């Protein structure tokens, strides 16, 4: 896994590779790691595929029941529900999740939940095995209040490098854009991002 989420002027964008690995064998080369827990609250998954799928399904259930009673939940609330599951079951889980969402009051927000189950609100976040190779690049190239096109380029270039150096990462680059306008899915193929 190479995953990231980046806030920008109009909201937030999530990005991910598509490789799933059992050892050196690529068990799935077209995986969808960008997961919907609510209309405009999505997450990026890393770690055990079983664990992160189980957690995401439970969170989706919690937020569906929240919505029926109290209306649309905040991104902070979604992050809290993720944290509660990750913290209380830390002994039995291997999950690293980035939560990204768009409110109209709060706009774009990003929360990262590493292995221990702690929460950290950030302007942008990177995670997964491939993230190690782009700490330098992302820190040098991230700016606040970028445009949609600039943020797409930043994520495309960042994950391109993560894929280039991390054997566990690869395939297509997927993105999900979260703004007031709605939800837009993007996909970028190897022939595009490898020549960057």
């Amino acid at each position: 896994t190479s995953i990231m989420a980046v806030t920008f002027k109009d909201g937030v964008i999530l990005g991910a590779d598509s490789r799933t690995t059992t050892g050196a064998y690529i068990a799935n080369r077209v995986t969808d790691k960008l997961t919907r827990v609510h209309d405009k609250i999505w997450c990026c998954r890393s770690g055990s595929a079983a664990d992160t799928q189980a957690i995401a399904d439970i969170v989706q259930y919690h937020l569906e029941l929240y919505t029926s009673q109290y209306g649309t939940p905040s991104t902070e609330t979604a992050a809290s529900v993720f944290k509660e599951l990750c913290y209380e079951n830390k002994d039995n889980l291997t999950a690293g999740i980035i939560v990204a969402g768009y409110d109209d009051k709060n706009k774009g927000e990003v929360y990262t939940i590493p292995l221990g189950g702690s929460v950290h609100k950030l302007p942008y976040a990177i995670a997964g095995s491939g993230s190690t190779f782009i700490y330098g690049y992302c820190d040098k190239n991230f700016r606040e209040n970028m445009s949609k096109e600039e943020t797409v380029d930043f994520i495309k270039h960042s994950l391109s490098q993560a894929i280039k150096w991390d054997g566990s990462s690869g395939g297509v680059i997927r993105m999900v854009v979260l703004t007031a306008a709605g939800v837009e899915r993007l996909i970028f193929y190897p022939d595009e991002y490898e020549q960057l």
Partner: protein
């Protein structure tokens, strides 16, 4: 006893009517880190033999130096070094196989899997395998590591037994090899897009192709 550090993945090969083909990608991995991107793992010996090596790269470089020294040594006091007394694929393999088995017997192996591909003096195709344990075997198709699991099944559909070899042209064989390299790139996490390919033919000699790329890929169905 050691552990491999910088490693190379699959080497694949097969026989066809007039010779042999061998291929291997240009990556040197450092665990999951794809560290070195310009590593040549096919090493020609003369104009009749190509040795393909996977596993530990430091040991590969050592074996490369042994083969270079072998050519120098064979030329000493040998007026027919470029004719009747040139190095044969069979000579080069037996030497390597001896070294590999001796090194495993001292509990200090060369951490590699090796395929020697070539054409003999009488025109006969040569294709044989040897690894860190000194284990050897021959087959119409041969592959190491992941290639053994994914390439062999595809290459065996072209040449399933000995009698299929005369019926297989160089165009059909190369096509099969290139497709197998694409499949390995799809499915092996320690592989790269860039690879080298070598053809040893009894008529046209040794053709060494560098900087080849995996092309015609499908992702579109990313559904």
């Amino acid at each position: 006893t050691q552990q491999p550090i910088v490693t190379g993945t699959s080497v694949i090969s097969m026989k066809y009517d007039n010779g042999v083909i061998i291929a291997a990608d240009n990556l040197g991995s450092y665990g999951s880190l794809l560290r070195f991107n310009g590593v040549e793992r096919l090493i020609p010996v003369g104009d009749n033999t190509v040795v393909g090596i996977s596993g530990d790269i430091s040991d590969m470089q050592h074996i490369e130096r042994l083969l270079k020294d072998l050519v120098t040594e064979n030329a000493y006091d040998n007026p027919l070094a470029d004719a009747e007394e040139a190095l044969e694929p069979s000579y080069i393999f037996e030497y390597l196989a001896t070294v590999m088995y001796q090194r495993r017997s001292k509990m200090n192996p060369l951490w590699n899997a090796i395929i020697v591909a070539g054409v003999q003096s009488n025109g006969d195709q040569f294709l044989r395998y040897v690894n860190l344990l000194g284990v050897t075997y021959s087959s119409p198709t041969l592959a190491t590591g992941f290639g053994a699991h994914m390439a062999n099944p595809l290459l065996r559909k072209v040449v399933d037994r000995e009698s299929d070899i005369p019926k297989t042209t160089v165009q059909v064989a190369e096509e099969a090899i290139v497709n197998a390299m694409r499949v390995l790139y799809y499915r092996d996490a320690r592989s790269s897009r860039n690879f080298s390919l070598a053809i040893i033919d009894k008529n046209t000699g040794l053709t060494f192709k560098k900087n080849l790329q995996v092309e015609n890929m499908k992702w579109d169905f990313a559904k």
